[PDB]
């Protein structure tokens, strides 16, 4: 999934993984009784324009301190890097059942350098491989073989370095989940009716952007829902799909409630959330829980050598 | 989710949970939380009339003895009764090439009284409700409740009968995951492994009956699974289909290999069963195993009196 607070800290762990796998001459990697040839890499800017559609926009100077990645790329973007982690999309409410309104504005749309689609944003780890097309395996479960070669095969300093990159990526990861409101549906209803409790939040039925209708807990912000007339005060999902839009009930969607994201709900939900995650999930969501439960976990998969018979090609076997 | 030999061990937790409603006068169910109506029944045979698709084939006498229901009808339908709940489909092996074959033959096609189709056999506990339309709870998560309602505020000896329905739903209910080979597909890998080497099964990918591709543990009866000539030795799916059946090779499929289904793997997978159900299972087979992990844990819902008055109401706290 992409996400470009966190794609370079990605793309680190994919770059570390391959310069161990090319240092050991390993060139295969068996996944699920399937042998997938990897592609050879030169050097960082070589793997950077392989598996990461920005790279020509950015024309960045990457270096051997991978922990530097991704901040080398938050220094351009500037911004947008804490707008994007504390973004969310426009929240609808139906009061009734024949009526949604807009009820919190979206955040303010993203510019990036040279107007970057969200989709050059990817690391494309299955670029790694050369022959992948056949590949089921998702994102995050990638992220973790590669980070599982790191761990297993990595120096005591590469290991170091991989943790701070797994760290980096679960903050910001978590941070996005919470401030779109996403994190509800993501954990346990327990776990979510709690820490709604615990932190004075308001559970409604709602859709974010476009996607179906889900559970969110906003800040009601000192407001009784009960006793809001919508119709007087916000504008209709309807309506927006026209130029039928009342300036003054767009300007009241900015101000009524809240997605709550400080720091205190924050450590409630990191708290709690890796142990108490909602099963039945997909799509974009599904492999953001994932991510977040793997670079908090940690538990990596174990990485068998396959011994070198001929002693001709040498070839690792993951899961 | 259908199944003829466990039908009426779930159609008396339903009426007991009715009856006992209907003695206090109990009109609603809240249910997440939502409030449903219940439909009021005049006696046993007015229920199973409302709820079982095949009551006006059997025409039972069923009476208040619910430990006698499910017995009476296993009583009519005699040697049907074992061989579904040890019953197979075809199981279909694709080696490697360009042919699947079948490897196992199904169990022998069943036929019930009247040739009822098994989906007549089905207890629609939503029936009990007069507006369940946007009701969404499936039926283990409504059997389990009906069972709660049971223990919360039946008598003793209603409580003891819970218990021996619920037994005989488990003991049914899993030996037919196991012995149809649905079992793998409904437990985490790790385990069905940890079975399957206990059990000396072997793990391939396979097709029962006309299902997508599931993982399978057969097995293999000591046969090296790599040295057959699957095309000397099997019917070809397709040959199947189009009756192109060379006895020797469907006879074959009866003597290979088989689904495991012996008391020793039984045993063993139910000590590990509701521990470690699949996360990833849907439809059908999530069905069945919620229904063998509820009998088999017994953890009821949280039943409140909700009441108040003039109107009786029970809110199910989940």
């Not at 996944?31 to 024309?59: Q, R």
């Not at 911004?79 to 504005?105: A, Q």
């Amino acid at each position: 999934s992409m996400n470009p607070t966190t794609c370079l800290n990605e793309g680190a762990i994919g770059y570390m993984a391959i310069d161990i796998l090319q240092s050991q001459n390993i060139e295969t990697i068996t996944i699920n009784d399937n042998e997938y040839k990897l592609n050879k890499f030169n050097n960082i800017k070589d793997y950077i324009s392989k598996v990461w559609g920005a790279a020509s926009v950015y024309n960045l100077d990457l270096g051997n301190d991978y922990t530097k990645w991704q901040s080398s790329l938050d220094n351009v973007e500037t911004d947008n890097i804490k707008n994007y982690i504390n973004g969310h999309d426009n929240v609808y409410y139906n009061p009734g059942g024949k009526n949604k309104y807009l009820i919190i504005e979206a955040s303010k749309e993203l510019k990036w350098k040279g107007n970057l689609n969200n989709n050059k944003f990817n690391v494309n780890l299955k670029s790694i491989f050369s022959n992948a097309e056949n590949l089921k395996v998702g994102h995050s479960d990638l992220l973790k073989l590669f980070s599982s070669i790191v761990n297993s095969k990595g120096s005591d300093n590469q290991k170091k370095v991989l943790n701070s990159l797994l760290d980096n990526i679960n903050d910001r990861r978590l941070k996005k989940l919470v401030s779109t409101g996403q994190w509800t549906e993501a954990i346990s209803d327990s776990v979510a009716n709690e820490i709604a409790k615990n932190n004075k939040l308001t559970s409604i039925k709602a859709q974010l952007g476009s996607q179906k209708t889900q559970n969110v807990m906003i800040d009601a912000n000192g407001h009784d829902l009960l006793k809001i007339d919508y119709d007087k005060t916000f504008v209709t999902a309807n309506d927006l799909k026209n130029k039928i839009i009342d300036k003054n009930k767009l300007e009241n969607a900015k101000n009524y409630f809240k997605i709550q994201n400080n720091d205190k709900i924050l450590e409630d939900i990191k708290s709690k959330f890796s142990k108490n995650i909602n099963e039945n999930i997909k799509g974009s969501i599904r492999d953001h829980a994932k991510l977040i439960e793997f670079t908090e976990n940690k538990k990596f998969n174990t990485i068998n050598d396959n011994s070198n018979s001929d002693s001709k090609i040498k070839s690792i076997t993951c899961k």
